[PDB]
Write a protein that binds this ligand. Structure first.
Ligand SMILES: [Ca+2]
Ligand SMILES: [Ca+2]
Ligand SMILES: [Ca+2]
Ligand SMILES: [Ca+2]
Ligand SMILES: [Ca+2]
Ligand SMILES: [Ca+2]
Ligand SMILES: [Ca+2]
Ligand SMILES: [Ca+2]
Ligand SMILES: [Ca+2]
Ligand SMILES: [Ca+2]
Ligand SMILES: [Cl-]
Ligand SMILES: [Cl-]
Ligand SMILES: [Cl-]
Ligand code: NA
Ligand code: NA
Length: 479
């Protein structure tokens, strides 16, 4: 514990010698001990009083940097459990900026207005917590999205939390963990909103709409039953032309696959949440021959995933959707091209398996389906993490590093150059963190040191090269 150690140290007295206290401060300046909000709150008043007292009984430069920027130095390594939300951080800030902090620093001849001082930190972390609370006010459950399928660009996910006003907070651990938390709680809803929009799209055919309904039930509701989803599926299913089913008594009429069993059990019962058949229960399966495409909409043929995966009988047209996926320059673009075309997360997984089983001798039309599904499965892995922070940089790097071992052997067969898959994923999902903020925080902390040096009549101080080496290590170790 950095604050804890600092308190023990400065408590040893010996304040009548400047360098003994000047070393105990330089240690903390570079210590690694992470803090907790309750732990800072419980130690703040004493730690700040010590700092203030170390500077009143030494006058040295490092004591004054420590006291003036103790607020930001202590926040920088704070580890917060974001399930508790902002209130523990506001409560902390309340202690940091209380009247005893201003009296302690004022009475010591120091400032309250350093960039990482109690005034700047209280004002800025308060605005940030306010932005955080606002970013979490969205849809709490899938039922909310189904009622209001608002489409949120993931490019906007947590963006108010990394605006320039908060540049000097950006490298703090609790900020980076909060971006991660916000991403985790917002991005999942976009594929659901896009699917709900198709299911409710009155310019699509009933079979198309009925299948989108079933993908929604399976990806986002499992066994939790939504009455609107039930109502939507039954209305579309009841209007599906009976010409789309294999008639009873034909060879291979029975549903052949886990997918076909699930689609058939729902249609037969008019119930999205029926997924099995009673052994002996007669269920018509959907045709998977090229003719059944006439019952689908041209742009979303893959939403009938059993037909699109029946490659020896049927070739779905995925050239248009591959054109849009391959030209996508943002998360919103690529996810919207994927989901509206029927390349949900599960369909990407199934169509990737069905096409790569034909490798290396693919036709151009199959390669279009396989590129869409392959890129698609990477996008769906990345989407829930997409954000402007270091966590998404970590998550993207881990996913990108798996692409060559997964697909190095089949990219030529798909018509892609070497690293073709990484090329497309980078173009629409590459991390876009405002890394300039790292430099802004370092500049700010070092300006405060500069002021301390000049105040102490120094062209250079020990505090500078120590804080420098701490910040310099974090910028390389993290970013
Ligand atoms: Ca945490
Ligand atoms: Ca907790
Ligand atoms: Ca927790
Ligand atoms: Ca709790
Ligand atoms: Ca077949
Ligand atoms: Ca066959
Ligand atoms: Ca075109
Ligand atoms: Ca997979
Ligand atoms: Ca095989
Ligand atoms: Ca993770
Ligand atoms: Cl988290
Ligand atoms: Cl098959
Ligand atoms: Cl096949
Ligand atoms: Na603003
Ligand atoms: Na590696």
């Amino acid at each position: 514990g950095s604050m804890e150690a600092l308190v023990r140290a400065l408590e040893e007295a010996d304040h009548a010698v400047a360098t003994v206290v000047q070393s105990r401060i330089l240690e903390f300046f570079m210590a690694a001990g992470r803090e907790t909000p309750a732990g800072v709150r419980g130690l703040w008043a004493r730690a700040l009083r010590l700092a203030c007292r170390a500077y009143v009984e030494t006058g040295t430069c490092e004591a004054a940097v420590l006291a003036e920027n103790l607020a930001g130095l202590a926040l920088w390594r704070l580890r917060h459990d974001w399930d508790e939300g902002t209130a523990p951080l506001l409560e902390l800030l309340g202690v940091v900026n209380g009247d005893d902090t201003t009296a302690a620093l004022t009475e010591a001849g120091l400032r309250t207005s350093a960039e990482f001082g109690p005034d700047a930190m209280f004002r800025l972390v308060s605005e940030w917590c306010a932005a955080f609370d606002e970013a979490l006010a969205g849809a709490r459950s899938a039922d909310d999205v189904l009622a209001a399928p608002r489409v949120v660009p993931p490019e906007q996910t947590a963006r108010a939390l990394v605006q320039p006003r908060f540049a000097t907070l950006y490298d703090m651990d609790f900020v980076q963990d909060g971006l991660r938390y916000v991403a985790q709680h917002t991005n999942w809803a976009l594929p659901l909103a896009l699917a709900v929009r198709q299911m409710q799209n009155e310019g699509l055919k009933p079979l198309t709409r009925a299948l989108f309904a079933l993908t929604i039930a399976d990806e986002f509701f499992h066994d939790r039953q939504n009455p609107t989803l039930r109502e939507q599926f039954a209305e579309a299913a009841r209007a599906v032309d009976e010409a789309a089913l294999v008639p009873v008594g034909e060879v291979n009429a029975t549903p052949r696959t886990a997918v076909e069993v699930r689609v058939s059990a729902a249609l037969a019962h008019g119930d999205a949440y029926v997924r099995e058949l009673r052994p002996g229960t007669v269920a018509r399966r959907l045709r998977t021959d090229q003719g059944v495409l006439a019952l689908l909409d041209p742009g979303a043929q893959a939403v009938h995933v059993a037909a699109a995966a029946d490659l020896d009988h049927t070739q779905v047209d995925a050239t248009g959707v591959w054109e849009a996926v391959a030209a996508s320059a943002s998360p919103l673009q690529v996810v919207e091209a994927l989901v509206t075309a029927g390349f949900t997360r599960r369909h990407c997984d199934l169509l990737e398996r069905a096409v790569l089983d034909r490798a290396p001798r693919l036709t151009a039309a199959q390669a279009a389906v396989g590129c869409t599904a392959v890129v698609g499965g990477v996008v769906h892995r990345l989407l829930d993490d997409y954000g402007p922070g270091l966590d998404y940089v970590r998550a993207y790097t881990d996913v990108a590093d798996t692409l060559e071992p997964l697909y190095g052997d089949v990219t030529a067969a798909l018509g892609l150059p070497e690293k073709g898959v990484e090329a497309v994923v980078r173009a629409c999902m590459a991390p876009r963190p405002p890394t300039e903020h790292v430099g802004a925080a370092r500049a700010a902390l070092l300006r405060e040191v500069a002021a301390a040096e000049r105040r102490a009549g120094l062209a250079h101080s020990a505090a500078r090269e120590a804080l420098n080496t701490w910040l310099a290590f974090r910028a390389q170790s993290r970013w």
